[PDB]
Scaffold this active site. Structure first.
Site: not given
Lengths: 313, 43
Positions: A6-7, A9-12, A14, A29, A130
């Site tokens: 998937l996409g 962000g955050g801590f890595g 998906v 995640k 966010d």
């Protein structure tokens, strides 16, 4: 074993891995190359939290697929969510002919769904912080398009500190994070949602040609609408050539004029409820609408289950 | 756009950066832009 991706962000990452047989659509995640002990332990506070909770509109965790399991070079856990079908709220916002707006009521869904997802999060005092198009997924529903808020937990959960402050992907949206300040008050969801919403109605926000530190003057030298050169404009009094209900300018200009602010944003005739009460009453109302033919095309009326023909007549 | 201060002064400014620029390679700054500055003029 398992499937695909998937996409980010955050801590890595998906990931759309599957027990490839029956099609177990789980989200994964995983973690990012170590952090400070209180920063990798915060990752584990997230996992317990997005599992600690379940609300339609906001994904819940499937725990861990017992089959294949730790392909994780961490000794730290992973996270498995219920992956929803092709609905990255963005996806459509670009769609193509939502340029000039996405006037559905799929505004009315989204305006509602989220309003009741945020709901649940000010219930557990977990400010999402966010809010973007790319955390929300409009996925096909047993009745009328359920949309779910995936991926995110930058989530300043009162009492158990913040998570991350990773600041990651498309900043283009959030509220007076002239990096940090003390006002990580509930308020800052209401802002993002608002534009998110605006954006959805029409196609902009207070504005995003220009940029982030390019705005802060965005915040006007305020509760107005703005300025040009040739033709360019950057705005929140008169919500544009969109495709909404005649009487939903009725919400907009007076909802959003309130959902798009700073510090403590609210509607100063009363102490109501920020999103909920106002938006809900502005979202329900039952609306009849009677074309004419005496060429005055339409007319629309707000109606209680308590009135009949000759009332109208 | 405009203001009344079309005083001599406004050459001295352009020259100055013009000069700056020439010494180095910038000015108070021009990545970003024009109405993108006015905060250039510092808070």
């Amino acid at each position: 074993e398992m499937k695909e991706r998937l996409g980010t962000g955050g801590f890595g990452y998906v990931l759309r891995w599957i027990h490839q047989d029956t099609g177990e659509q789980v989200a994964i995640k995983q973690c990012r190359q170590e952090l400070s002990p209180k920063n990798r332990e915060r990752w584990c506070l997230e996992i317990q939290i997005m599992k600690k909770l379940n609300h339609p509109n906001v994904v819940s965790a499937r725990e861990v697929p017992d089959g294949l399991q730790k392909l994780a070079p961490n000794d730290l856990p992973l996270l498995a969510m219920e992956y929803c079908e092709g609905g990255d709220l963005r996806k459509y916002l670009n769609q193509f002919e939502n340029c000039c707006g996405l006037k559905e009521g799929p505004i009315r869904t989204l305006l509602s769904d989220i309003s009741s997802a945020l709901r649940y999060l000010h219930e557990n005092r977990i400010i999402h912080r966010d809010l973007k198009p790319e955390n929300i997924v409009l996925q096909p529903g047993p009745q009328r398009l359920i949309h779910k808020i995936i991926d995110l937990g930058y989530a300043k959960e009162l009492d158990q500190g913040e998570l991350c402050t990773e600041f990651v992907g498309t900043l283009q949206y959030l509220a007076p994070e002239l990096l940090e300040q003390k006002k990580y008050t509930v308020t800052v969801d209401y802002w993002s949602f608002g534009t998110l919403a605006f954006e959805c109605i029409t196609g902009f926000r207070p504005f995003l040609p220009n940029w982030q530190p390019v705005q802060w003057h965005g915040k006007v030298r305020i509760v107005v609408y703005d300025d040009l050169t040739g033709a360019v404009k950057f705005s929140s009094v008169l919500p544009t050539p969109n495709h909404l209900s005649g009487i939903l300018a009725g919400k907009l200009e007076r909802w959003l004029q309130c959902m798009l602010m700073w510090h403590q944003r609210t509607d100063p005739q009363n102490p109501n409820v920020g999103c909920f009460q106002a938006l809900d009453s502005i979202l329900s109302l039952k609306l009849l609408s009677v074309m004419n033919m005496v060429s005055g095309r339409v007319h629309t009326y707000p109606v209680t289950e308590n009135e009949n023909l000759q009332n109208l007549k």
